Amino acid sequence: SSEAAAISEAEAASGSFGRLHCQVLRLITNVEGGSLEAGRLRLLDLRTNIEVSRPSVLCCFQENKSPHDTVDLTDLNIKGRCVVGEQDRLLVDLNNFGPRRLTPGSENNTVSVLAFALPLDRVPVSGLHLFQSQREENRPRMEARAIIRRTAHHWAVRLTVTPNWRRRTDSSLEAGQIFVSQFAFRAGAIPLTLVDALEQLACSDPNTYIHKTETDERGQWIMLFLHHDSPHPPTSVFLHFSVYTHRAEVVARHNPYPHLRRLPDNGFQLLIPKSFTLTRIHPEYIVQIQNAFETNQTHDTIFFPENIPGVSIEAGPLPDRVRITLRVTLTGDQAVHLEHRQPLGRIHFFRRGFWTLTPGKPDKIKRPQVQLRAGLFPRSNVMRGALTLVIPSWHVFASLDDLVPLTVSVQHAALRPTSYLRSDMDGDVRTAADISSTLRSVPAP
Amino acid sequence: SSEAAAISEAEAASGSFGRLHCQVLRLITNVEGGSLEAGRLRLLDLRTNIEVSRPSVLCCFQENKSPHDTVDLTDLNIKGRCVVGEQDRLLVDLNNFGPRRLTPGSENNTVSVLAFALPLDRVPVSGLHLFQSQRPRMEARAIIRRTAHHWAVRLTVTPNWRRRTDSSLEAGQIFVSQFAFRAGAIPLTLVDALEQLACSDPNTYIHKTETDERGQWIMLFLHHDSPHPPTSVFLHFSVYTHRAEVVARHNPYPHLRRLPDNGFQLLIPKSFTLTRIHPEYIVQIQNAFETNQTHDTIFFPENIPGVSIEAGPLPDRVRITLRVTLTGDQAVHLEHRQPLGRIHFFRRGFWTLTPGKPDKIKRPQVQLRAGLFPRSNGALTLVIPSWHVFASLDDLVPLTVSVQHAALRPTSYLRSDMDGDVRTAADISSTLRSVPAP
Structure with missing residues (x-):
């Protein structure tokens, strides 16, 4: 109609801090509220909500800003977060693996994460x-x-x-x-x-x-x-x-019962087969079950671990026909118990095309939660134009067209007068920068 | 192997009160544990557990013992029970219709019920x-x-x-x-x-x-x-x-909540309260399903004590309409967005129209009946005379029944028909319980 209708439609399409739409969200935040001593672990509230219209795998990983970056632990390390559902409040483990303490200011208060939703199609x-x-x-x-x-x-x-x-x-x-x-x-x-x-x-x-x-x-x-x-x-x-x-097209080697609980439409939940307690003198435990999946290369099999504060569970591709094996490592300052039949994570399947192996690596691998990274690199790294979501922790990448559209909401409190929004890929990649996050103590459980 | 192996294997297959297997269970119980005044309602604990290995529609209906029986209310009336899941504890509304109250062993205190599980195949x-x-x-x-x-x-x-x-x-x-x-x-x-x-x-x-x-x-x-x-x-x-093969006329949101694999949950679009001066309310939504006769569409209502919700076939392309009637001794409130029941789909052939009846219909919960009658158009079939439809025992989900030790009497016994497809637990005892608070 009139130019007034053109302006309101543009404001609706581009959104605001309170309601945004993108395939990949980038948060650049400044840690505040308290301090984080070297060798400590605290929760970081990114003060951001993610919504999708269909149950999906809502992920929040620390960003690798360059394809040449390693997945080595960083001084300020954000443990990857995986939630299966339609909404999530981004709350992640922040480990200070670096040598120096964290001050309310200085160069070392800026962390960055990429959030995105993976589809859960029906896989019998x-x-x-x-x-x-x-x-x-x-x-x-x-x-x-x-x-x-x-x-x-x-x-x-x-x-x-x-x-x-x-x-x-x-x-x-x-x-x-x-x-x-x-x-x-x-x-x-x-x-x-x-x-x-x-x-x-x-x-x-x-x-x-x-x-x-x-x-x-x-x-x-x-x-x-x-x-x-x-x-x-x-x-x-x-x-x-x-x-x-x-x-x-996907078969189990053995009955998924009792260690794998069937989930509706896609995947299984892995249940701990034996109680164990992680301490600083027994900081690791390897959970293994006598079962594996056979897809004949029709599907990728990914394990998305629970979000247990202070523990890092291996996450990512599970190779066909090899016993399902996941390493659990203590990353907090306190002992963590895991009970028999408690869920450790979720196995979910993806069609042959969704995940593609990064052309420079041998094959797809898993990594600890604390080493989960995501990046946005151009399709010009399919040799060694448009941006693609690359998970270097797994040696795989996906096209933004195949992700589930996010509805992002940064809460008003996290906003400062320096906060701004950026846009790339015709709005498929939205960045929220100079927002504020709060430190929180790890609960008692 | 030996004659000893033959007996132990047969005892494993035939089960006992604590664990038995069948396609249809019959419970013949004697109501005890108190009194039930004429025109009053109390809960009846059948003291029995039903288990299945795959999510199903676990039903428990009053039995019609003859094909010539009506679905009219009986003096001691059991409201049908529908549970979706893998287990259920049979606890049903017992209405004392008819003129005189129920005392301990007044005369006829024997009610009879049929339990069975309907499959929930994946229907997109x-x-x-x-x-x-x-x-x-x-x-x-x-x-x-x-x-x-x-x-x-x-x-x-x-x-x-x-x-x-x-x-x-x-x-x-x-x-x-x-x-x-x-x-x-x-x-x-x-x-x-x-x-x-x-x-x-x-x-x-x-x-x-x-x-x-x-x-x-x-x-x-x-x-x-x-x-x-x-x-x-x-x-x-x-x-x-x-x-x-099944389409909705409109977006199921917001009145129909999608369920995994099969069906939708119907959410009350508007709060209402059933009282003695307004004992009925008709829930209706602007939506319907179209299957082109590839599937039957059945509504299984919630189990709300003192309320009777219509249950059964929903005709295609007709606005989903369900009557809610007060059958208890107390006013009942139903909240906006509270679930009223579940719509579930069944492939063509599962339910067959009873020969001699015009078509498939719904019925109030208090008039739900099931029977076991031979193929009268030899083997027994599950007939739902409330709906004018019947199913073959082969298509039901196998039950694992567990009658509680307390419900047993020294005279309780077990029966078997259809080569173990129909098991009867007879002369067991059920307890009366008061209806819980609003």
């Missing part, structure tokens, strides 16, 4: 995939007797067995052990060329579950591997499960 | 479907950019807002506008959905969308939920191909 996963067995003259003794009924969309198997239980000791488990057995049953009317997944629906014992499953088409049997998590495994077991066609 | 639904318009003014200026997998539209506009009063809404009104933008490089024969990603105003959202292939434009209909609509609006949204 087979938990109990029907792998092909490898054995052959003498085959399994057809130990279990099954009643197979074909329903509208799957095959239902009702099965009883008197299994041969074996104690397997395992110091990675809070119980220190787990009882295992295995047996086979005739495939019968089940078309083994069509089915590729199982789902347990009922069991006569509440601590017994199908751990993995194999098939042999030439022999027409299905091998089941059971796990039992109690001191006394049952003499006989009834099992009710379904055999169906899933055709998922 | 387009919230902002690109319907075809019916008939210019290219009011809004849009920047269309192609991302890796969809089309991203950045758009600014100065809309012409009109206030629409609506007494079904807690705010009494809603601001509406509409405009169009040029499709540009977007293939309107291929894309079928939108998703709002960012808006310059926190109370403005895309309500619905239409397309015209001959004009190559996309019409947007905005809603604003505040007293002062903004003069200009920035919008960032995506245009993509969803290929959902």
Whole structure:
């Protein structure tokens, strides 16, 4: 309409400190409120809110301003922050790993972070995939007797067995052990060329579950591997499960239960298999589970750890077919306990194209939370124009077009008369500079 | 193996009160633990736990023992119970309709209930479907950019807002506008959905969308939920191909909250209080689903003691309308945005119309009934005479039942039918409990 309509539309599109829109947010803040002695750890309130319209991975990493920067710890170090959801309040660990104390002023009060949201598309996963067995003259003794009924969309198997239980000791488990057995049953009317997944629906014992499953088409049997998590495994077991066609592109090597809790649409939550306490004399613990994912290069598998103050958990790509292993290192001035079955983080999947390997590095790797970095470097580093989000901690990069649009809100309190806003990439990259952040003490828990 | 292995395996399969397995559970219980005056309501603790290994619709309805039975209220009436999840503790409304009160063992104190789990398969639904318009003014200026997998539209506009009063809404009104933008490089024969990603105003959202292939434009209909609509609006949204078999007529937001994998949660659009002088209220939203007969749409209401909400099939393309009736001894308040129930979808074939009935209907919670009748148009089928529909036991989610030790009597026993698909726990005891505070 009139030029007044043109001005209001432009003010709406460009936003303000209270409400902004971008693919990547940059915050340049000055630490205030108190001091941070060398060797201390305190929370830094960036005084900024992030919103998205669809559940996403909301990340906030320290910025690497040059492609030649290392991911080595810095004197003022910001631990990466990963939240899965639709909103987050940016509150990060600030470690003073440097030699000198932090003063209310001086050159060393300016930290910078990049915030962005990664999409969580729907990625189906087979938990109990029907792998092909490898054995052959003498085959399994057809130990279990099954009643197979074909329903509208799957095959239902009702099965009883008197299994041969074996104690397997395992110091990675809070119980220190787990009882295992295995047996086979005739495939019968089940078309083994069509089915590729199982789902347990009922069991006569509440601590017994199908751990993995194999098939042999030439022999027409299905091998089941059971796990039992109690001191006394049952003499006989009834099992009710379904055999169906899933055709998922991502499969688990073993049942994600009990260490990986399924999440809606995309990914799993990793649950601590054994309680441990990090102290300054035992500052590290390696969490490992006997499980891995196979994608056949159709998806990237990233682990996004919980936000536990004073602890640094390895984050990033998990390679296919290698046991899921994550290192937990103490980075605070105080002991931190982690309880059995407490969540350590979330595994999430990304389509083949989203993450691309940085052309200069061998492959995709994980890194401690305290070494998470993000940068905005041009596509002219696909050799060694437009800016791309590069995560050098992982040796990967993504295009800004594929990120989830952020709705940023810097709170009025954080603003000073020197605060200003900058814009790049036609508003896809917005920077909030000379805003103020508050130091906070780490809570008691 | 040996004859000893045969017995232990069979005992594992057949279960016991503490742990059994079936497709449909029948509980035959005797109400005890106090009195229930005629015309009064108390909670009945069936003292039984239901478990499933995958999220399901766990239902517990009063049993109709014969196909010739009506769904009329009975003297001792059990209100249907619907829980969505993996476990439930069966606790139901027991209404004493009929003339005389219930005393300890007065006469007939035996009520009977059927429990079962309905599957929740993954059914995608387009919230902002690109319907075809019916008939210019290219009011809004849009920047269309192609991302890796969809089309991203950045758009600014100065809309012409009109206030629409609506007494079904807690705010009494809603601001509406509409405009169009040029499709540009977007293939309107291929894309079928939108998703709002960012808006310059926190109370403005895309309500619905239409397309015209001959004009190559996309019409947007905005809603604003505040007293002062903004003069200009920035919008960032995506245009993509969803290929959902189920579409909503309007944006499910704000009255329908999307649920993971299947369905929506219906949120009360306006506070109301059921009293003895206003014992009914009709909740209605301006929305409906279109499935083209690929899915049945069922509403499973919340379990609010003393209130009976209509439950069952919702016909496609009809505004979602549910009657809420006071059945307790006390006034009940329902708050704006409180959940009223859940809409869930079922693939064609799961529910089949009962032969002899016109079509599938909903019913008040207090009239929900289930029966186990043979295929009368041999094996038993789950019939919901309240809805004129039935399902096969093979498609239900296998139950893990656990009757509490306390509920057991020395005469309690177990029954089996359908080769263990139907298990009955008979002569167990249930406790009466008072209805909790408002």
